[PDB]
């Protein structure tokens, strides 16, 4: 049968994205966070094109398309960055970008040290669970359909069907080369727990950058337009509880 679904996921996978950070400059909260925000803007562009090229994404209402990308953005970045850290530096550092790698010191200067530690943990899971490139790609796609308005999307049913379909693709990736339903069910438990763990992290990052945005002038950290827009328009909906993650587990 079909390697079509995976042919597609691999084909649309975004390439390397640099932050434009000059590493000869002193590690300061301002410089680091300003580079992160700029990296954010560049990655969003890629994320949008990627999401819109996913199988069945367009059979979602046009207004819903942009909203789910915007709500799930942070989590997508968390997850992919963790995978990058794993594949490039075996999870010992946060590999945001080739030119923006966080070591211990930068984690502290970022003023988000504990969160960075939680992200390294997440990254380490890819190794401890021997997550495959295929598992990674299907799980990343699933994250795009993991956070929505409590009182529904414009056409919630089209979303529901798509999400259900991405879960079924995850199901068969797990069943491929697998044998008995018990082996499958345990991997599924592991992978859904991993997906869920992205949400608490993304939420802290939401809180952190929202606060930073409000704070920006007095702290000398600047935000590009698209970031400032999503942070002040979409993020507050999550922080105010109108938009929530779809946890598998309680
Ligand atoms: O690959 C990445 C991964 C992250 C991860 F922290 F969410 F994992 C990331 C975060 C931010 N931001 C958040 C913050 F608050 F942590 F610094 C800033 C912003 F402005 F985009 F939201 C910008 C680019 C990336 N790029």
Swiss-Prot record:
This is Androgen receptor. Changing residue 57 to L: In a patient with severe hypospadias. Changing residue 95 to C: In PAIS and prostate cancer; partial loss of androgen binding. The gene is AR. Changing residue 81 to V: In PAIS and AIS. It comes from Homo sapiens (Human). The lineage of its organism: Eukaryota, Metazoa, Chordata, Craniata, Vertebrata. Changing residue 112 to I: In PAIS and AIS. Changing residue 163 to Q: In AIS; loss of androgen binding. Changing residue 116 to Y: In AIS; loss of androgen binding and of transactivation. Changing residue 80 to V: In prostate cancer. Composed of three domains: a modulating N-terminal domain, a DNA-binding domain and a C-terminal ligand-binding domain. In the presence of bound steroid the ligand-binding domain interacts with the N-terminal modulating domain, and thereby activates AR transcription factor activity. Agonist binding is required for dimerization and binding to target DNA. The transcription factor activity of the complex formed by ligand-activated AR and DNA is modulated by interactions with coactivator and corepressor proteins. Changing residue 123 to P: In prostate cancer and AIS. Changing residue 52 to E: In prostate cancer; found in bone metastases. Changing residue 35 to G: In PAIS and AIS. Changing residue 198 to M: In AIS and prostate cancer. Changing residue 33 to H: Found in prostate cancer. Changing residue 78 to M: In PAIS and AIS. Changing residue 178 to G: In prostate cancer. It is found in: Nucleus; Cytoplasm. Changing residue 81 to I: In prostate cancer. The chain holds residues 670 to 919 of 920 of the full protein. The record marks 52 as: Interaction with coactivator LXXL and FXXFY motifs. In the absence of ligand, steroid hormone receptors are thought to be weakly associated with nuclear components; hormone binding greatly increases receptor affinity. The hormone-receptor complex appears to recognize discrete DNA sequences upstream of transcriptional start sites. Transcriptional activity is enhanced by binding to RANBP9. There is a cross-link at residues 177, 179 (Glycyl lysine isopeptide (Lys-Gly) (interchain with G-Cter in ubiquitin)). Belongs to the nuclear hormone receptor family. NR3 subfamily. Changing residue 187 to H: In AIS; strongly reduced transcription activation.
């Amino acid at each position: 049968c079909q390697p079509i679904f995976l042919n597609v996921l691999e084909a649309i996978e975004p390439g390397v994205v640099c932050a434009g950070h000059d590493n000869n400059q002193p590690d300061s909260f301002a410089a680091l966070l300003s580079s992160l925000n700029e990296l954010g803007e560049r990655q969003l562009v890629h994320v949008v094109k990627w999401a819109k090229a996913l199988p069945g994404f367009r059979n979602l209402h046009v207004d819903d398309q942009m909203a789910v990308i915007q709500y799930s953005w942070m989590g997508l970045m968390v997850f992919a960055m963790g995978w990058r850290s794993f594949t490039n530096v075996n999870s010992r550092m946060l590999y945001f970008a080739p030119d923006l790698v966080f070591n211990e010191y930068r984690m502290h200067k970022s003023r988000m040290y504990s969160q960075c530690v939680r992200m390294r943990h997440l990254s380490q899971e890819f190794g401890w669970l021997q997550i495959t490139p295929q598992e990674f790609l299907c799980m990343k796609a699933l994250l795009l359909f993991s956070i929505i308005p409590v009182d529904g999307l414009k056409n919630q049913k089209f979303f529901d069907e798509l999400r259900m379909n991405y879960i079924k693709e995850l199901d068969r990736i797990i069943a491929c080369k697998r044998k008995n339903p018990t082996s499958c069910s345990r991997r599924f438990y592991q992978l859904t727990k991993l997906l869920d763990s992205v949400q608490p992290i993304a939420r802290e990052l939401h809180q952190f950058t929202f606060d930073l945005l409000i704070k920006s002038h007095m702290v000398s950290v600047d935000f590009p337009e698209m970031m400032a827009e999503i942070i002040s328009v979409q993020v507050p909906k999550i922080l105010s509880g109108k938009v929530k993650p779809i946890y598998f587990h309680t």
